[PDB]
Design a protein around this ligand. Sequence first.
Ligand SMILES: [Br-]
Ligand SMILES: [Br-]
Ligand SMILES: [Br-]
Ligand SMILES: [Br-]
Ligand SMILES: [Br-]
Ligand SMILES: [Br-]
Ligand SMILES: [Br-]
Length: 251
Amino acid sequence: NNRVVKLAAGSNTQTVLPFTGLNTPSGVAVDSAGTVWVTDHGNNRVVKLAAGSNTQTVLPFTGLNTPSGVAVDSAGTVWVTDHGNNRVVKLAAGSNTQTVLPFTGLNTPSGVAVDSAGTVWVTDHGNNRVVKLAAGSNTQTVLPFTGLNTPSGVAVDSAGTVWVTDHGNNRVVKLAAGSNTQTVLPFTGLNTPSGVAVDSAGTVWVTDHGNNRVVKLAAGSNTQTVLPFTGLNTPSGVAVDSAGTVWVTDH
Ligand SMILES: [Br-]
Ligand SMILES: [Br-]
Ligand SMILES: [Br-]
Ligand SMILES: [Br-]
Ligand SMILES: [Br-]
Ligand SMILES: [Br-]
Ligand SMILES: [Br-]
Protein backbone atom coordinates (compact mmCIF):
# COMPACT_ATOMS: atom_id res chain seq x y z
CA ASN A 1 0.00 0.00 0.00
CA ASN A 2 3.05 2.29 -0.29
CA ARG A 3 2.73 3.72 3.18
CA VAL A 4 4.20 3.58 6.67
CA VAL A 5 1.84 3.11 9.60
CA LYS A 6 2.41 3.31 13.35
CA LEU A 7 0.59 2.22 16.48
CA ALA A 8 1.25 3.51 19.97
CA ALA A 9 1.41 0.89 22.69
CA GLY A 10 -2.07 -0.15 23.72
CA SER A 11 -3.70 1.79 20.87
CA ASN A 12 -6.18 0.37 18.35
CA THR A 13 -5.99 3.42 16.02
CA GLN A 14 -3.04 3.51 13.65
CA THR A 15 -1.51 6.66 12.18
CA VAL A 16 -0.29 6.89 8.59
CA LEU A 17 2.97 8.82 8.44
CA PRO A 18 3.13 11.73 5.98
CA PHE A 19 5.64 10.19 3.61
CA THR A 20 5.06 10.95 -0.07
CA GLY A 21 5.77 9.14 -3.31
CA LEU A 22 6.85 5.82 -1.81
CA ASN A 23 7.13 2.77 -4.05
CA THR A 24 7.26 -0.60 -2.30
CA PRO A 25 8.88 0.66 0.93
CA SER A 26 10.77 -2.05 2.75
CA GLY A 27 13.18 -1.35 5.60
CA VAL A 28 12.32 0.97 8.46
CA ALA A 29 14.36 2.12 11.45
CA VAL A 30 13.71 4.55 14.31
CA ASP A 31 15.78 6.24 17.01
CA SER A 32 14.84 7.41 20.51
CA ALA A 33 14.14 10.94 19.19
CA GLY A 34 11.26 9.59 17.08
CA THR A 35 12.99 10.06 13.71
CA VAL A 36 11.95 7.49 11.09
CA TRP A 37 14.08 6.21 8.20
CA VAL A 38 12.53 4.13 5.40
CA THR A 39 14.06 2.33 2.47
CA ASP A 40 11.93 3.39 -0.46
CA HIS A 41 12.89 0.23 -2.26
CA GLY A 42 11.07 0.86 -5.54
CA ASN A 43 12.65 4.32 -5.90
CA ASN A 44 16.23 3.27 -5.02
CA ARG A 45 16.38 5.75 -2.15
CA VAL A 46 16.25 6.22 1.62
CA VAL A 47 13.81 8.77 3.03
CA LYS A 48 13.60 10.29 6.50
CA LEU A 49 10.93 12.00 8.59
CA ALA A 50 11.89 14.06 11.63
CA ALA A 51 9.40 14.00 14.50
CA GLY A 52 6.77 16.69 14.06
CA SER A 53 7.62 17.24 10.38
CA ASN A 54 5.20 16.65 7.56
CA THR A 55 7.80 16.61 4.77
CA GLN A 56 10.36 13.86 4.33
CA THR A 57 13.97 14.39 3.32
CA VAL A 58 16.00 12.13 1.03
CA LEU A 59 19.37 10.94 2.23
CA PRO A 60 22.24 11.63 -0.22
CA PHE A 61 23.00 8.01 -1.10
CA THR A 62 23.83 7.32 -4.71
CA GLY A 63 23.69 4.33 -7.00
CA LEU A 64 21.42 2.24 -4.81
CA ASN A 65 19.48 -0.60 -6.40
CA THR A 66 16.42 -2.14 -4.72
CA PRO A 67 17.68 -1.23 -1.23
CA SER A 68 16.22 -3.28 1.58
CA GLY A 69 17.25 -3.08 5.24
CA VAL A 70 18.14 0.10 7.09
CA ALA A 71 19.76 0.61 10.48
CA VAL A 72 20.69 3.64 12.57
CA ASP A 73 22.76 4.32 15.69
CA SER A 74 22.79 6.95 18.43
CA ALA A 75 25.36 9.02 16.51
CA GLY A 76 22.88 9.35 13.63
CA THR A 77 24.82 7.15 11.18
CA VAL A 78 22.57 5.29 8.73
CA TRP A 79 23.40 1.91 7.13
CA VAL A 80 21.45 0.57 4.15
CA THR A 81 21.64 -2.84 2.52
CA ASP A 82 21.99 -2.14 -1.18
CA HIS A 83 20.37 -5.42 -2.08
CA GLY A 84 20.72 -5.00 -5.85
CA ASN A 85 24.45 -4.24 -5.65
CA ASN A 86 25.47 -6.93 -3.10
CA ARG A 87 26.85 -4.31 -0.69
CA VAL A 88 26.14 -2.36 2.50
CA VAL A 89 26.56 1.44 2.46
CA LYS A 90 26.53 4.02 5.24
CA LEU A 91 26.25 7.78 5.64
CA ALA A 92 27.38 9.75 8.68
CA ALA A 93 25.17 12.56 9.94
CA GLY A 94 25.64 15.65 7.81
CA SER A 95 27.78 13.94 5.19
CA ASN A 96 27.53 13.76 1.40
CA THR A 97 29.98 10.89 1.00
CA GLN A 98 28.68 7.35 1.42
CA THR A 99 30.97 4.53 2.53
CA VAL A 100 30.91 0.97 1.18
CA LEU A 101 31.56 -1.40 4.05
CA PRO A 102 34.21 -4.13 3.72
CA PHE A 103 31.82 -7.09 3.61
CA THR A 104 32.75 -9.66 0.98
CA GLY A 105 30.81 -12.28 -0.91
CA LEU A 106 27.30 -10.98 -0.21
CA ASN A 107 24.40 -12.15 -2.37
CA THR A 108 21.09 -10.23 -2.40
CA PRO A 109 21.59 -9.06 1.21
CA SER A 110 18.44 -8.14 3.03
CA GLY A 111 18.56 -6.84 6.57
CA VAL A 112 21.16 -4.91 8.54
CA ALA A 113 21.63 -4.28 12.23
CA VAL A 114 24.22 -2.47 14.33
CA ASP A 115 25.14 -2.11 18.00
CA SER A 116 26.77 0.59 20.10
CA ALA A 117 30.19 -1.02 19.54
CA GLY A 118 29.93 -0.46 15.80
CA THR A 119 29.55 -4.17 15.00
CA VAL A 120 27.42 -4.68 11.89
CA TRP A 121 25.33 -7.77 11.06
CA VAL A 122 23.79 -8.49 7.65
CA THR A 123 21.37 -11.16 6.54
CA ASP A 124 23.16 -12.51 3.48
CA HIS A 125 19.84 -13.74 2.18
CA GLY A 126 21.14 -15.34 -1.01
CA ASN A 127 23.77 -17.32 0.90
CA ASN A 128 21.42 -18.51 3.66
CA ARG A 129 23.59 -16.93 6.34
CA VAL A 130 24.09 -14.03 8.72
CA VAL A 131 27.47 -12.26 8.54
CA LYS A 132 29.05 -10.14 11.29
CA LEU A 133 31.65 -7.45 10.60
CA ALA A 134 33.77 -6.69 13.66
CA ALA A 135 34.44 -3.04 14.41
CA GLY A 136 37.98 -1.85 13.78
CA SER A 137 39.49 -5.15 12.67
CA ASN A 138 36.87 -5.51 9.90
CA THR A 139 37.02 -9.29 10.41
CA GLN A 140 34.02 -11.04 8.86
CA THR A 141 32.52 -14.08 10.49
CA VAL A 142 29.50 -16.21 9.71
CA LEU A 143 27.20 -16.73 12.66
CA PRO A 144 26.58 -20.42 13.42
CA PHE A 145 22.90 -20.41 12.64
CA THR A 146 21.84 -23.61 10.97
CA GLY A 147 19.18 -24.59 8.49
CA LEU A 148 18.42 -21.05 7.30
CA ASN A 149 16.60 -20.58 3.99
CA THR A 150 16.57 -17.09 2.40
CA PRO A 151 16.74 -15.24 5.73
CA SER A 152 15.52 -11.69 5.52
CA GLY A 153 15.09 -9.53 8.60
CA VAL A 154 17.60 -9.18 11.40
CA ALA A 155 17.65 -7.41 14.73
CA VAL A 156 20.11 -7.27 17.63
CA ASP A 157 19.18 -6.35 21.19
CA SER A 158 21.26 -4.66 23.90
CA ALA A 159 22.33 -8.04 25.27
CA GLY A 160 23.80 -8.81 21.81
CA THR A 161 21.39 -11.61 20.84
CA VAL A 162 20.71 -11.86 17.05
CA TRP A 163 17.14 -12.50 15.83
CA VAL A 164 16.49 -13.49 12.22
CA THR A 165 13.33 -14.05 10.20
CA ASP A 166 14.09 -17.35 8.46
CA HIS A 167 11.83 -16.29 5.65
CA GLY A 168 12.01 -19.47 3.54
CA ASN A 169 11.25 -21.69 6.56
CA ASN A 170 8.42 -19.53 7.96
CA ARG A 171 10.07 -19.12 11.35
CA VAL A 172 11.99 -16.70 13.58
CA VAL A 173 15.22 -17.83 15.22
CA LYS A 174 17.60 -16.25 17.73
CA LEU A 175 21.21 -16.93 18.67
CA ALA A 176 23.18 -15.45 21.56
CA ALA A 177 26.74 -14.30 20.84
CA GLY A 178 29.33 -17.04 20.97
CA SER A 179 26.61 -19.66 21.23
CA ASN A 180 25.88 -22.80 19.27
CA THR A 181 22.24 -22.95 20.47
CA GLN A 182 19.65 -21.36 18.21
CA THR A 183 16.11 -20.98 19.55
CA VAL A 184 12.97 -21.05 17.41
CA LEU A 185 10.53 -18.53 18.78
CA PRO A 186 6.92 -19.81 19.32
CA PHE A 187 5.34 -17.71 16.63
CA THR A 188 2.79 -19.79 14.74
CA GLY A 189 1.40 -20.01 11.24
CA LEU A 190 3.87 -17.60 9.65
CA ASN A 191 4.17 -17.18 5.88
CA THR A 192 7.32 -15.62 4.37
CA PRO A 193 8.03 -13.44 7.44
CA SER A 194 10.08 -10.41 6.45
CA GLY A 195 11.08 -8.07 9.30
CA VAL A 196 11.80 -8.41 13.00
CA ALA A 197 12.14 -5.85 15.80
CA VAL A 198 13.01 -6.23 19.47
CA ASP A 199 12.82 -3.74 22.34
CA SER A 200 14.81 -3.49 25.58
CA ALA A 201 12.00 -5.29 27.47
CA GLY A 202 12.63 -8.33 25.23
CA THR A 203 9.36 -8.18 23.28
CA VAL A 204 9.64 -9.31 19.65
CA TRP A 205 7.55 -8.13 16.69
CA VAL A 206 7.56 -9.77 13.23
CA THR A 207 6.01 -8.72 9.93
CA ASP A 208 4.20 -11.86 8.79
CA HIS A 209 4.35 -10.62 5.21
CA GLY A 210 2.47 -13.50 3.55
CA ASN A 211 -0.45 -13.22 5.99
CA ASN A 212 -0.80 -9.41 5.88
CA ARG A 213 -0.28 -9.05 9.62
CA VAL A 214 2.17 -8.06 12.36
CA VAL A 215 2.62 -10.57 15.17
CA LYS A 216 4.06 -10.01 18.62
CA LEU A 217 5.45 -12.15 21.45
CA ALA A 218 5.31 -10.00 24.56
CA ALA A 219 8.19 -10.44 26.97
CA GLY A 220 7.47 -13.36 29.28
CA SER A 221 4.54 -14.63 27.21
CA ASN A 222 4.25 -17.67 24.95
CA THR A 223 1.07 -16.47 23.19
CA GLN A 224 1.45 -14.54 19.97
CA THR A 225 -0.89 -11.64 19.34
CA VAL A 226 -1.73 -9.74 16.16
CA LEU A 227 -1.40 -5.96 16.23
CA PRO A 228 -4.64 -4.12 15.32
CA PHE A 229 -3.34 -2.49 12.16
CA THR A 230 -6.07 -1.92 9.57
CA GLY A 231 -5.78 -2.65 5.84
CA LEU A 232 -2.22 -3.97 5.79
CA ASN A 233 -0.89 -5.63 2.61
CA THR A 234 2.42 -7.61 2.62
CA PRO A 235 4.07 -5.66 5.47
CA SER A 236 7.82 -5.73 4.98
CA GLY A 237 9.61 -4.02 7.84
CA VAL A 238 9.05 -3.20 11.49
CA ALA A 239 10.73 -0.91 14.01
CA VAL A 240 9.98 -0.11 17.65
CA ASP A 241 11.31 2.46 20.11
CA SER A 242 11.46 2.49 23.87
CA ALA A 243 7.70 2.40 24.85
CA GLY A 244 6.45 -0.08 22.31
CA THR A 245 5.35 2.26 19.55
CA VAL A 246 5.59 0.19 16.38
CA TRP A 247 6.16 1.39 12.83
CA VAL A 248 5.50 -0.87 9.84
CA THR A 249 6.19 -0.47 6.14
CA ASP A 250 2.95 -1.44 4.44
CA HIS A 251 4.87 -2.49 1.41
BR1 LIG B 1 6.36 20.35 6.79
BR1 LIG C 1 21.86 17.64 6.50
BR1 LIG D 1 33.61 6.55 7.33
BR1 LIG E 1 29.39 -9.55 19.08
BR1 LIG F 1 12.46 -25.78 13.30
BR1 LIG G 1 -1.02 -6.78 20.02
BR1 LIG H 1 9.26 -7.68 1.85
